[PDB]
């Protein structure tokens, strides 16, 4: 608990020690932190906690460092959107430990009727996860993934791979559902995670390949194409396909 | 009026007895001749919210016309919500019906296998996102509605394996403005009204 | 396949997931005189010329594909404009 | 009971799975559920946590015990 001076170590790490680590970082030292992991070891060694990305955005003048942090805040928000969707779908069926939303939904008996492989609630999994229904439907979707699963006659996959690629294509693509994700879900989830309000986060003012490598390390999944591969493709609604995964 | 919550059943009460007509006379008395309580506004709002007709509420709002000289926000906001809930209940109905028909097909594979192996063995307003709508909420899920509705057009003709505009071939005609949402064009209707029977 | 002959859809998301293309085109023949006439008055309107008269046409899209494009346009909350381009 | 080809590539999938499982990783491992009344609950923090004991099921160096 903060006694009387822990609010001063808090009150300096957000106001002056933060603005000092920013002041070193806007001067462009030789070999400024390049990827996300060198950037995180930069702020951690200086003592500033990483969950103050909102304050570090508000304290910077340079349009470069605005973009560097905009890579970082989106990368960790999509990391948590990846995590809680996986958790809310695994622990949702009926038994033992399950999520709070799975227990709360007493409805859906008013629509399905008994006149079977269906375990009733198994038909409408779009409501168990913690997102609005319009965003959620493309998070669990398979229609733009038929051609690739046709062609693979050796490599198996999982449903975790599918919900992965639904999340990567709704952030990186020329899809209109991708524009929907950045305007109503990814922007609002940044505001309640890292104090970065929805106005500053925009899909246009972010670099498509650097945000992609930032998800390569935060989300914990590695893909066969690299950052330069996405730049050298035609824009597409779901440009990333199951065969683009390795392990 | 019945359930309510604590603190002299929520709408503020008084001396025991006090029949609800003169009790409501007290309730309008505190609001105008002001000596009221913080839960007294929730009285007249919760009563007006369930008792007036939509026309009576619209007259109540229209007494404010010095401010808000504009009109018809109420039918506009009702039509957005009516469009949203009608779009929502159809999209879930198409999504559930797609998933029963597809898993019916997997059972259809399974039954033809178990006979094949056997044969070889024998041998009122509720604002959610319709207000301040500029993030294009319609594009995400109406796209799913169009895809899923005609997905059932595919799935129906898989079951059967197991002409609304150009009807003059039948002998009916090609009524102008006969797109699938509408039944009569604007010029065609107004010809039916005055210029004929 | 015995699956009719071009009367259902294209499945724009499901058939070309990596490519951003409209659809594959068909051929058909426009010999209906009322459709041939309405296309003629379209080109007459676009050119200010009461001398242009149509000789034929070829609908390179199924009528089911025209309906799918109409519903996608209303899903985008935007209208449909006809663009008369030279080949 | 699903197709024969996908039965034999699922059988091939579980066939290649122990090859990944052994050699460099330990040659498969046995798990103890270790119920939530053990005096290892001091190592536990939250009441919905799940602890798992891990015995090597190999020649090892008789150390194991993660």
């Amino acid at each position: 608990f903060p006694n009387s001076r822990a609010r001063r170590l808090a009150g300096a790490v957000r106001t002056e020690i933060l603005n000092k680590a920013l002041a070193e970082l806007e001067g462009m030292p030789p070999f400024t932190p390049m990827d996300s992991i060198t950037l995180t070891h930069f702020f951690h060694l200086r003592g500033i906690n990483m969950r103050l990305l909102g304050h570090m955005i508000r304290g910077t003048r340079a349009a470069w460092l605005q973009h560097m942090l905009h890579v970082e805040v989106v990368a960790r928000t999509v990391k948590r959107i990846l995590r809680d969707v996986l958790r809310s779908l695994v622990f949702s069926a009926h038994g033992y430990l399950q999520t709070a939303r799975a227990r709360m939904q007493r409805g859906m008996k008013k629509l399905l009727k008994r006149p079977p492989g269906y375990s009733r609630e198994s038909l409408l999994r779009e409501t168990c996860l913690n997102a609005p229904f319009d965003i959620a439907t493309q998070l669990l979707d398979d229609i733009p993934y038929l051609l690739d699963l046709m062609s693979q006659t050796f490599r198996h996959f999982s449903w975790t791979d599918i919900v992965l690629l639904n999340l990567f294509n709704l952030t990186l693509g020329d899809s209109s559902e991708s524009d929907e994700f950045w305007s109503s879900f990814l922007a609002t989830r940044c505001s309640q995670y890292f104090d970065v309000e929805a106005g500053s986060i925009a899909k246009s003012r972010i670099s498509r390949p650097a945000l992609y490598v930032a998800m390569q390390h935060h989300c914990g999944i590695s893909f066969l194409p690299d950052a330069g591969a996405l730049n050298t493709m035609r824009p597409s609604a779901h440009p990333l396909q199951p065969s683009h995964l390795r392990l | 009026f019945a359930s309510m919550l604590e603190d002299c059943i929520e709408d503020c009460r008084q001396e025991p007895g006090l029949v609800p007509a003169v009790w409501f006379d007290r309730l309008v008395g505190r609001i105008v001749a002001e000596n009221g309580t913080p839960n007294d506004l929730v009285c007249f709002i919760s009563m007006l919210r369930a008792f007036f007709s939509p026309i009576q509420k619209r007259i109540f709002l229209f007494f404010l016309h010095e401010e808000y000289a504009r009109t018809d926000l109420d039918p506009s906001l009702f039509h957005s919500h009516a469009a949203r809930r009608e779009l929502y209940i159809d999209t879930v109905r198409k999504l559930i019906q797609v998933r029963m028909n597809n898993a019916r097909f997997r059972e259809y594979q399974r039954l033809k296998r178990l006979q094949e192996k056997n044969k070889k063995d024998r041998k009122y307003l509720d604002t959610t996102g319709l207000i301040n709508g500029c993030v294009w909420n319609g594009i995400s899920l109406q796209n799913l509605n169009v895809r899923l509705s005609e997905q059932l057009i595919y799935q129906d003709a898989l079951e059967k394996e197991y002409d609304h505009t150009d009807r003059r071939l039948l002998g009916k005609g090609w009524i102008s403005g006969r797109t699938s949402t509408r039944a009569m064009g604007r010029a065609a209707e107004l010809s039916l009204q005055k210029f004929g029977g | 396949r015995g699956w009719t002959a071009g009367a259902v859809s294209s499945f724009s998301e499901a058939a070309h997931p990596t490519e951003d293309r409209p659809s594959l085109v068909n051929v058909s023949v426009i010999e209906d005189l009322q459709i041939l006439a309405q296309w003629e008055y379209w080109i007459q309107l676009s050119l200010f010329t009461a001398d242009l008269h149509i000789v034929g046409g070829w609908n390179l899209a199924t009528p089911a594909q025209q309906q799918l494009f109409d519903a996608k346009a209303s899903a985008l909350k935007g209208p449909i404009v006809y663009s008369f381009l030279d080949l | 009971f699903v197709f024969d080809r996908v039965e034999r590539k699922a059988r091939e999938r579980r066939k290649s799975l122990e090859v990944l499982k052994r050699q460099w990783a330990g040659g498969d491992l046995d798990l103890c559920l270790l119920p939530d009344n053990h005096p290892f609950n001091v190592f536990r923090l939250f009441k919905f946590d799940r602890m798992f004991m891990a015995r090597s099921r190999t020649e090892a160096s008789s150390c194991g015990c993660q």
Partner: peptide, 30 residues
Amino acid sequence: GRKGPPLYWKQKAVQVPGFMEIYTLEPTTS
């Protein structure tokens, strides 16, 4: 070997049972 009625087909895809490969057939015709 891609011919016949599309209900049953045969399992060629990695987990798709076979009746979703009509959901990828654009109607090629002339």
